[PDB]
Design a protein around this ligand. Structure first.
Ligand SMILES: OC[C@H]1O[C@@H](O)[C@H](O)[C@@H](O)[C@@H]1O
Ligand SMILES: [Ca+2]
Ligand SMILES: [Ca+2]
Ligand SMILES: [Ca+2]
Length: 189
């Protein structure tokens, strides 16, 4: 799976800047658990600049819940990055997993850090919008640079149980440990 992200700097606040319209929209259709018509999915747009990667995820989710003690089992969005795009079967120093729930609470998997994660969440009719900025750790991107990338939507029900796991490039729920499951994102001017 391949996608592109246009150069640009949006304001992280949960509001949709006009600039988001200049970049393509990708959908989370890779199902690991649940179904596209019954579980949470997101419409995603990506932008970038020399210091950060920006992600706008509009999540469809009629029932919001975060009762489960496991952060990945609360309604949330996870963002995966492979800066050198080695597509290894495990996380290298440059690889990271970031997570933020509908309450804008951040959690981190391997490689993720709050020092490199700025987020805002705005609830909308039928779901919520996540707008994030991830600071580059090991690279200073230039046009046509290609990174490994994925975005996952965790869907929890009224019972505090995760019933849906859907992402862009991974239908196996191994993104948290296997960068080879990420797709390719070309950073274009
Ligand atoms: O952060 C670790 C978590 O990552 C999530 O993407 C997976 O769905 C969970 O199974 C895993 O425990
Ligand atoms: Ca904004
Ligand atoms: Ca890597
Ligand atoms: Ca839900």
């Amino acid at each position: 799976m391949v996608a592109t992200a246009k150069y640009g700097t949006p304001v992280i606040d949960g509001e949709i800047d006009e600039i988001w319209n200049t970049t393509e929209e990708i959908e989370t259709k890779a199902v690991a658990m649940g179904s596209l018509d019954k579980n949470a999915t997101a419409k995603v747009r990506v932008l970038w600049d020399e210091n950060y990667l920006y992600v706008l995820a509009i999540v469809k989710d009629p029932v919001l819940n975060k009762d489960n003690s496991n952060p990945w089992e609360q309604d949330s969005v996870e963002i995966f990055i492979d800066e050198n795009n080695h597509k290894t079967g495990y996380y290298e120093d440059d690889d990271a997993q970031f997570r933020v729930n509908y309450m804008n609470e951040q959690t981190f998997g391997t490689g993720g850090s709050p020092a490199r994660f700025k987020t805002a969440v705005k609830l909308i009719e039928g779901g919520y919008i996540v707008e994030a900025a991830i600071k580059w750790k090991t690279i200073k991107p230039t046009p046509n640079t290609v990174i490994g990338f994925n975005i996952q939507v965790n869907d929890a029900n009224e019972k505090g149980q995760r019933v849906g796991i859907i992402s862009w490039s991974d239908p196996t729920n191994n993104s948290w440990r296997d960068p080879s499951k990420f797709g390719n994102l070309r950073l274009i001017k």
